[PDB]
């Protein structure tokens, strides 16, 4: 009984991901998001610890949804004739990091450090759960404005994490690494680090560095804003052309630009209220 247990509200968005509605769980008035996915528009399918065939996105959300984290939690889901419906957490108030950066411009490094740190913890969490997001970008990050917590969303391009080569990809091309542009192959962690380099430049400069394949494989990074040397070093390291030259997640979080990070509550109080 789906329609008679969540009160459906206004459309939050639609696109290559589906159609996401605001909603309230009638049981306890909890804010929820209700996401619809047309069955015909699904590429990768999986099965859970029940054998029921479901979209990979549901598989991945279940693997990461255990406990608290900087990942959006899947509360429930239903099957319909031609669609699947996903019940997800909805922070309130909320704004995604793409709109936040558009409105504010290039973020102060203190704020970019707190945001980037939380994204690193969230991505580490996914990899710990055997999940590879494959579409890390500002558009897929929610800001709980009151708590100052970042939430990773939209696993519709993800895969189970593995150590062999990936030769398929349906994420955002401007956040994809040069080895995907040049050779249609990549490894999961090193490609994730590349997208995180794109993300960090986006935070400190006000937009992404590369728009075109030539720029991506060119691996030249021009800074259009005043950015500290330590932060430019971390960005250029993440965006090394050779995947093996990129830093590990440990090396990113041990980098000197990443020290003395603000707490989420401090980040809200200083930068978001």
């Amino acid at each position: 009984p789906l329609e008679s247990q969540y009160q459906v509200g206004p459309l939050l968005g639609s696109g290559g991901f589906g159609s996401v509605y605001s909603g309230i769980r009638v049981s306890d008035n909890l804010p929820v998001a209700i996401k619809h996915v047309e069955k015909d528009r699904i590429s990768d399918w999986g099965e859970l610890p029940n054998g029921t065939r479901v979209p990979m996105e549901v598989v991945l959300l279940k693997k990461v949804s255990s406990g608290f984290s900087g990942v959006i939690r899947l509360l429930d889901w239903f099957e319909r004739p031609d669609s699947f419906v996903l019940i997800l957490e909805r922070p309130e108030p909320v704004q995604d990091l793409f709109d936040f950066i558009t409105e504010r411009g290039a973020l102060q490094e203190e704020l970019a450090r707190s945001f980037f740190w939380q994204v690193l913890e969230a991505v580490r969490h996914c990899h710990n759960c055997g999940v590879l997001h494959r579409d890390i970008k500002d558009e897929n990050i929610l800001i709980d404005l009151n708590r100052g917590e970042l939430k990773l969303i939209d696993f519709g391009s993800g895969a189970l994490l593995k150590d062999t080569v990936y030769t398929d990809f349906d994420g955002t091309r401007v956040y994809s690494p040069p080895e995907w542009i040049r050779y249609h192959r990549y490894h999961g962690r090193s490609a994730a680090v590349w997208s995180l380099g794109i993300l960090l430049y986006d935070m400190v400069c006000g937009d992404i560095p590369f728009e075109h394949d030539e720029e991506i494989i060119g691996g030249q990074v021009f800074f259009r804003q005043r950015v500290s040397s330590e932060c430019q070093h971390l960005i250029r390291w993440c965006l090394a052309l050779r995947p093996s030259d990129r830093p590990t997640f440990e090396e990113i979080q041990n980098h000197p630009w990443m020290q003395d990070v603000l707490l989420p509550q401090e980040t809200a109080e200083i930068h978001l209220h």
Partner: peptide
């Protein structure tokens, strides 16, 4: 200059 979203 113009800043835009990018689909997938």
């Amino acid at each position: 200059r113009k800043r835009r979203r990018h689909p997938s």
